[PDB]
Paper text:
Most eukaryotic proteins are N-terminally acetylated by a set of Nα acetyltransferases (NATs). Here, we report [name] homologs from the filamentous fungi [name] and Neurospora crassa with significant N- and C-terminal extensions to the conserved [name] domain. Structural and biochemical analyses show that CtNaa50 shares the [name] structure and substrate specificity with other homologs. However, in contrast to previously analyzed [name] proteins, it does not form NatE.
In order to characterize the CtNaa50 [name] domain, we crystallized CtNaa5082-289 in complex with the bisubstrate analog (peptide sequence: M1pV2pN3pA4pL5p) and solved its X-ray crystal structure. Crystals of CtNaa5082-289/CoA-Ac-[name] belong to space group P212121 with one molecule per asymmetric unit and diffracted to 1.1 Å resolution. CtNaa5082-289 shares the GCN5-related N-acetyltransferase ([name]) fold with a mixture of four α helices and seven β strands. The conserved AcCoA-binding motif Q/RxxGxG/A in turn β4 to α3 comprises residues RSLGLA in CtNaa50 and interacts with the pyrophosphate part of CoA. The major differences are in three loop regions β2–β3, β3–β4, and α3–β5, which are longer than in orthologous [name] proteins. In particular, loop β3–β4 has a length of 32 residues, which is 30 residues longer than the human protein. This loop could be completely built and due to crystal packing folds back to the protein with the Q175 side-chain pointing towards the substrate peptide entry site. The peptide moiety of CoA-Ac-[name] binds at the substrate peptide binding site, while the two [name] loops, α1–α2 and β6–β7, connected by van der Waals contacts, fold over the peptide. Several residues surround M1p to create a hydrophobic binding pocket, which is typical for active [name] enzymes: L107, P108, and V109 in loop α1–α2, and Y264 and L267 in loop β6–β7 as well as W237 in β5. The active site of CtNaa5082-289 includes a tightly bound water molecule, which is important for acetylation and is also present in other active [name] structures.
Numbering used by the authors:
A (entry chain H): 1 to 5
B (entry chain A): 81 to 294
Write the structure that this text describes.
Amino acid sequence: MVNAL
Amino acid sequence: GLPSGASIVPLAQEHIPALRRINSLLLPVAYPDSFYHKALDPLASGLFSRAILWQDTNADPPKVVGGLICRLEPNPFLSVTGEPTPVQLPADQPQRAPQAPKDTPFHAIYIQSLALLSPYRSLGLAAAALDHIIATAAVLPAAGSNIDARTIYAHVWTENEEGLKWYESRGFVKEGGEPVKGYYFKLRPDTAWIVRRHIGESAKLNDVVHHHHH
Ligand SMILES: *C(=O)CSCCNC(=O)CCNC(=O)[C@H](O)C(C)(C)COP(=O)(O)OP(=O)(O)OC[C@H]1O[C@@H](n2cnc3c(N)ncnc32)[C@H](O)[C@@H]1OP(=O)(O)O
């Protein structure tokens, strides 16, 4: 799960 | 062998609404629409991304039950001559990917999102999607690609034991000795492990872990 950047 | 009714395909526009719903149900980071548009761009996240489809009966159109959205990047785990190296995590840029060496010839595949609805779990579907990605990376050079994907990696929230267990079972290792602080903007805790698996011509390095970083 990548961050929302 | 895939269970009857399952298929794995390159992620396409028709799968996005459903995969976005699945991610919204299973991953506690809200992604903006741009994330899903980039997942369709072969130059952004539109090469290694995969949909996991299910048909209950042969009369049903296959429906999305899970997927992996992935992005190609310069490889941040290897030197420009292929040695395993500790990762570089600039302290002012924790929400950014680990920094790769300038002008490296090696690539990494970054898994941005992984999700599978619970009725379809424990059937090897996500593992099969991962294997399809790895096999795609292996055959791309023979097809004339300049992509040399030597590692697959992801961030895993430190509270997500389900995900951590899956990545460990697939041969990934935690890299850097500690999770990334301040990785997530709104989630509490905001920490995430970097997990990585070396593949292809670098697969022999998979067991070489650095328990520190730069
Ligand atoms: C950022 O997005 C990265 S971190 C976020 C990860 N996602 C997440 O947490 C969302 C919610 N959870 C899930 O979606 C789900 O729990 C997964 C996708 C993380 C894992 O789902 P599964 O556990 O069902 O994983 P699969 O790979 O689909 O199945 C693996 C298990 O299936 C059995 N099996 C049967 N044949 C197999 C073959 N050929 N190869 C491997 N495994 C096979 C096994 O029982 C296997 O169990 P393991 O314990 O080996 O995983």
